[PDB]
Amino acid sequence: QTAVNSSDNPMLSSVTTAAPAADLSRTKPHEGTGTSERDPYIRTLHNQR
Amino acid sequence: KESLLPNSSSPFAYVEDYMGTNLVFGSPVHAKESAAVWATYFERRYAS
Amino acid sequence: DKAVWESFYRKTGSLDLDKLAESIKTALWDATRKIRSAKEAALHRSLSHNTRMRASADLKHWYEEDANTLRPLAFEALKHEAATPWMQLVQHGKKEEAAALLKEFEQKGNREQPPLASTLKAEDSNPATIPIGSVHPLFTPALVQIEEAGGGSVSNEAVCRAQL
Amino acid sequence: DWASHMQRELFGEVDPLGGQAHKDYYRDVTRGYSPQYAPRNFANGGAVAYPHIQSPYEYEEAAHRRVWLDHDVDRMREEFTQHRASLRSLASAQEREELLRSRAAEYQVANTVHESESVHPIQQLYNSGGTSRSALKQQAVADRYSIAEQHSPLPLTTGVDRDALDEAQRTKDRILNDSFTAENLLITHGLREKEKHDFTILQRTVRIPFQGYDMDRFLAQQKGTPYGAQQLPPNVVPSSMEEAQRTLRGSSATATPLVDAVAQKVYARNTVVDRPAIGEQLTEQIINIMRASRTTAEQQREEERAQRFGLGRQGALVQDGGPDQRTLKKHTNDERIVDAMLFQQNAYRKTPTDEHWNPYIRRSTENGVGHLLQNKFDIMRREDRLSKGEQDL
Amino acid sequence: ITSRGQFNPIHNFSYAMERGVRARDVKAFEKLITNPGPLRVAYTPDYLDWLHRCYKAKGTYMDARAVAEKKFNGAPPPGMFLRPAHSFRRLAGELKRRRAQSILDEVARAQGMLDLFERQPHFPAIHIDRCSRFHLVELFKEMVLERSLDSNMIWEKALLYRAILSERKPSYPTSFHYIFTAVEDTVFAPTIHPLAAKCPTLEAYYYYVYLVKKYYIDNAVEAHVVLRCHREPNAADLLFSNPPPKDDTEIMKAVELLRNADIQRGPPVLPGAYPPIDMLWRCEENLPLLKVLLFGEFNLIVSENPFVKFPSAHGFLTRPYSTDSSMSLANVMAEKRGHLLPSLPRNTATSIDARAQDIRRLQQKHHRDDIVSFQKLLRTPSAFSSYSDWSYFNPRAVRAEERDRLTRKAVEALKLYDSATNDIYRHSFEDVQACHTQRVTERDRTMPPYLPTLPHFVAIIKKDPHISFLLHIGLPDRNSSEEGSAKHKELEKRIYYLARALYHTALEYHNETVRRVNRQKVNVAASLLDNFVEQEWTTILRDKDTQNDKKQLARRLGRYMLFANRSLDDTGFPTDARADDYTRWMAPPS
Amino acid sequence: NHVVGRAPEPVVPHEQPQEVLRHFSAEERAMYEQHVKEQTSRQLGEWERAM
Amino acid sequence: EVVERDAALMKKTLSSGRRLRHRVESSRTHRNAGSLS
Amino acid sequence: RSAANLARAEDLIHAVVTAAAQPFGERRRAATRDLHMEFQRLAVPVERVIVANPVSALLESGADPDEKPVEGEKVNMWPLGAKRVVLYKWSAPNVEKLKAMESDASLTAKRLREIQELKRRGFLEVSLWRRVTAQERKQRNEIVEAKKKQVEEVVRTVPSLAHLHQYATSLYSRIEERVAEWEFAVLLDDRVLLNKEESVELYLPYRDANGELLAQGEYRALVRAFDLEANPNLHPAYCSVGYSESFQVFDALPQLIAQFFRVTHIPAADFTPFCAFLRDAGLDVPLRCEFEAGQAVTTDGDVYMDYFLQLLRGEAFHQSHAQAGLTEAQRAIEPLCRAHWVVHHPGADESEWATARRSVLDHAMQHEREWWFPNEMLDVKDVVTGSTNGLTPQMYPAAVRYGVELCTVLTAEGKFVDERGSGLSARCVVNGTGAAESVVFDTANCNGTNTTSVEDALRVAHGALRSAQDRHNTLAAFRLGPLSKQSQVLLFCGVNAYEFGGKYARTYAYAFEKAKKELEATAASGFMAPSLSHEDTERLS
16 A cells, blocks of 8 residues: 655656556456555465465 | 338348349349449449 | 156155156256257367367357357247247258248147157258358358358358449 | 435425535436435445445446436426326325325336345445434435436446547557556566566565464354354444545546536636637637647657556767667666567567477467467367366366 | 427427418417317417417428428438338338327426426416306316325315415406406305305414415415424424514414404304315305315416425425434444344444544535535536426426326337338438448357347256256245245246346446446346355255155256356356356456 | 453455445445355354354 | 538537517516507 | 338238238137037027116116016117116026025025135126128128239239248147137126126227227027136137127117207206116216216317217226126236137137136236337337337347347246047146246146156147147246337447448448458467457468
8 A cells, every 4th residue: 555646755756647547458377457455466376375 | 191101020031232223132123223323333433 | 667656756655746856857957968068069079070160269169158158048048949840940041941831831720758859850961051140149140141042051142243 | 204205305306405405415417417315324434324425437328328318317207297296186184195196107107216135144234324224214315317217118228429439449459568568577477487486585574374273164254154253343433524434425426528627627617717708709719729639649648658668768869979879777668668569579470370380389388378269169168168167178 | 309408399380381371570470379179278488489489480391391301292311212102111201200290299398287287396386267066066176186095185275375365466467367357256154053064264274364365475375385294293393484483472463453354344263174175176155265276276386496485394294304413333234133133343433433423524614515505506318307397396396207208108119110211211222322332141140049138048947957946846836835826926936036137237248347347237146046056956955755746856956056156148148268268358447 | 351251353355445335336346245145144153153 | 522511510519599588567566568559 | 211111021921921820710610609509409408598687776766676677678779888688598517506595585695705716607798799681791802802902912013922821821730729690799798796686787888999880770689698607718619609689789879869959069057868868768878978078178168079979989987897707907908809719719809808808907907918008118109209209229239138038037828638539638837938827737637547648738738738838938928028119220320320330331341241250369369368469360461
């Protein structure tokens, strides 16, 4: 739970506010649209047994 | 009631062109009007 | 097996008529279920064995036809069953045997069997036989013109004309 | 007791509010411009308590259910005539109240009041501050149509016409196609990737959260479950009545289908207009406006689209260096880029599975799982295991 | 189609103008408007202005259309051409236009009639000078009689009207004078007797005079309010007025002077019973009184809001304001919670009482301003509209339903008229020539055989083996027993809800905001239905072997797949996409 | 001390905020209530029977 | 040309002027009816 | 040319089928006359049937309210737009119970309700039957025979129709409900509730509705009597009947017009005394009719006579009580229900339809409502342009699917009773799948002995099922009929829109044959289809 929104810190000066996530969208199994914890920017949990 | 339109159940009796024309099985009025519309058309066509 | 089952419903007792109605209704449900099952099984074999449809990747193909959509339709039964042998013959698109039967008609002028087992025999199961008009029911009016006048087979002449 | 009062009003052929404006009763289109109870709730605060229609199809549907229930409202009316004549025949108050009592029992008038059942204290607060049982039974007003709704068949047909349904499918197709285009473009300029990387950048600052010494307890307390851990909702400053009512009525007003919108506007304008007309010339007027409306809006959409994706061309057609001349700006959408992108996806592609001779591209689950389902059996299985909350094999 | 503050035609102008009759002068038009048959409809200057202008315009229209059709021996939309006459399609379209326009006119007119007998301000006076017993009795039994729940109320209405009239005589316009013929003509019953059963007593009338004088009654409206509130236990309370009512001394004094000065020409208790209602309409002797009553309803109705004069009665006549209060919250909540749950911890109890007081404050504070701003926003089709929203109170105001049925018929006629446009007129020929360049291809260019439709889903949710069984065999038979009909009704009701949810999700699927909310409607629906199915399934299997019977045939169907966890997309079919993505699409709003 | 013999507070599957519920139709809202009522009734009754 | 015509038609919807209305006199006991004179 | 041939086909088929239908109608009416004759021997008669003049409710200034003394003696003639009062005598037990319970009747809600229910128990059906001259009958016989000859010649010319005849007959002998001078004019009242007074005001209209104007001459009123206790389900042959003596009918308007004006216009003085004059002769002019007639006016203020006459002659301001008991909805769907009910009662007279109209439409509007109601997806607004305007080639397959599913879901009911003499009967409710939603046996009808084998009951349920499924097939036919036919026009004459029409037709056929051939390969290959890449084939050719 973090906003990708533009920050005023000196080191955060590279950060550009993000467009909202693509609505009906089919991701690659290792990613996500970064909305929530249930759906991260990078998926760590394996899908195997 | 009284109108000019054939008395039938089948929709197939009301079938015509898209230009609203019937050169077959149309009434005499329908016949003349249609042939004259078409004549108008091909006239302007071969004229130009 | 009346020998066994008669006394279940009583009879000297008086008839249940609750039990009887229930078992009738249930039985019919079993039959219907069997029919729909059969139709779907047909579809399933079809889809599993077809490569060109497997080419476009669609789950939808499996759900876009089911016991509701497929044929035979139940609410259409009447017009197909109540028909005369002649009528049934022309419905399913065999014009040959229909014309034949009509010439033989003019010149001379609880049962167990589905009424349609007379007209439709094991030879009209072969997909090779089925006339082009009948194949895709939805479009039957429009595909009937490509057909031959008296034949079931496609007339090249009519088609070559239309194209020409 | 109140129920007999309501029935008493459903019996009379006169409007129970007498057509008068009451700040607490919204006369709703969806309900057939009928006087529904819509108080402002200050527990929520600033909010009128009442359904807000979010789509035109809900409107169409409600209208259709009225048209459907016509027959029943009519039998109800010929029943009501009988009733109130039988009321005229009664000379005393107590016997009249007996009649209204038993009949309000019979038409289930009491069942039309929908009370919140939540045993939870906070939900109780939301509802019962402004809107309560003591209040709802007191303020309730029944139209004939809400009564007929209870004894009647359920329509399996929504009022959506053939052609309206065509319009639906095309609206949906258009919008979706435009959103996928948009997203694929966000992927092309690479703003997605920059978004991910920037997330990585932001991570540098954050701590690991304190989850508590007893973690069950902490999690639970955070959610407000344990005993005496319940927190009240932050108190919201109520918004001006004009704003609340603009919200509520703006909702329904947005949803109104073309025909009704144009028609209402046309008659109500026809009263005060410079050169009014009745009969056919009125009708004609309507149609043309309607027939213009479509074209108008339709045209507009395209322009908007061409501004969004930068469609059309940059300069004049005949420029010295060819027609093709174009300029691309860093992160701007341009037709060239849209059709290039699309070209990239499928060029000579005959079918979606074209590359599936390659076993590793074959089983990639990216696009979906749909191409790896072959026989019915596996699809039943997949259905089964998705319903059991397990993973899909 | 009608809105607040809108004029409708009550006259048929078309029938005469098709015959060739027309007017030019204002006087000709005034000769056109007036009704020979007994009734007399007065008008505002405004409505007459509008009606005249409309008339003139109809003149221009029928003229330019008759002239147009004489020159060719309406005008096509910009890209269209006129099909030949005596072509099936054109005759079809023109028949449709004819019928639809007819219906539209019938609707505009009937809605006008509704306006007229609703006593809308642009129809100020309905005069009865020309009527005879037949007309008066019909008028009564259509307008007054049929609507009234209380028979005794009618007599009271008549008498109050008679007292209002007899007292307010100076300020009336000249056009009213005739009615006084009836007022003094009123027949009364001998003071305690052949008229005992036929006519009411004078004493009652004088009670009503007392009401008129003490309360200053100027209207049919204030008369309605007063007549509804006077017989109740709170009377002095309810009818207490903004200008304070006079003291009974002076009033009973002027009533003694009136009564006595009326004897020489030839705290009062609410009166006794009255003769059975039928008498009023079916006896000659009461014909004057009856007349008064009608003149009572169709006139004497003025705009002004009666609740400025009687602010105490606004809660009784129409519903009270919700913001106006006529124990502590924590105790109500503890009572709805019951004794089976722990009593509220007293932190939370305290905090909740705090909220109750704060909200109380908000209500008291916003009470007046909300009223003010609401009327102010209504004065400003537009988002705020109605059949009747007006600031003023109308006791004759029409039911919303009667107007709405008209409006619906009207929109039907409107779509019907717009339908004919493509039968009458056609596209350019070579344009449809180029339209047949691209054929309709079964696979792509055609719309898919599954659209969103209610019976599509209702067939999908009925297609499930468990639901099919539960429907046909499983539940006890619907016709046989009561439990049967009950169960059946509810199961179909829940299936229906779930279907509706799926459907409304399917239409709006393209936009996020809406789909999430719809999807929650779904979740609720599915939860309901699943609970029902599970419950009744358990019932079937537990209830009290023999081959192929109920319980065996149930057990053969396996485990029941919940519709809750079912993942169903746009088309009502299980999704193509991976479970995570679907889970994300249908994730609740925030 | 307070909580010993009492029931656990009902947990209604798919319980909604007032923010979503504002978009429910009168009929649909009636349905929602139906759901809640039946869930709560069932659970508290289950507690009674168990205890 | 067609779209131009329809636009020109939706310019004719906003071009509406208001015919002067005519107010009557408000009395307590009735509604005053004036006629064309 | 093909289109015209098709239309011609439908017209001919319609003729032949109807022709095959009539004799069933004859046998049915005969059997009904028979069973009615059996029942009416044993039961309670309606003895006095008397038409009289209406009696004024209004009292003179000296008279007292209580008497109701005058019923009127009799009436020799009934005007067309005028009300008459019919008096009957029905001694049926519920009527007695009502006279006693009412004459005992200061009022309670209870007894009011009791009286309402007792009223709902019995009811009377009042119709108008017209005599016929020998001339009219000979002209009818002549027309019927002309039609029969036309049908016989068309049957002889085109053989397949002579076959379709036998098809039709055998179909009717299946579908039909098995049952085991004067000619009808108008239905005045469908349902008359029971009175103590035994009298009803009836308004005769100007038009019996098929839309026609009414004849003149001899009419007598026919009264049928239905007590729901002895006859639930309202079988037409079980009822009590009585006839009024002959009276005559005509339209009184031209005589009274000629009498008053001694006629295009009326001056406006005379209008109100003219309507008064009319009400005095017995005619019925409502107040609304007067008003709106009055509201259409000449430059002189004149009421057009033809306008007023048109309003007096039509359904707007007044209706027969039979038509005032039916909803706008019922009146709007009535032609469909007619057609259907006519299929299941093959060759019925408008007499029968008059009797069963009420029950049929009511049962329809309750249980059947989904089938009959106008369905914006399924329905056809216009037969002429239906194929063009409302139905797109795009929306066609979706439309058809819609029809399918809606019929699949919906429900039909059917009934059967044992012909073998035990009163065993069954009712069945059935899905679009031919599945059974409900089956119920009714033991109320039959004798108390109830000696029946499981076999008989099985046959009973069988017949019940059969009828039910059939009812569903007919219902389906009507719901899905119009759009299917206009579909047929679209597809047949609009081929040149689709891929299988015109220049591409030849492609379609090609594909088609390939498919057959291809399928055979898959049959030979073990149902593992050959390579899409065609790497399997032996030759490059």
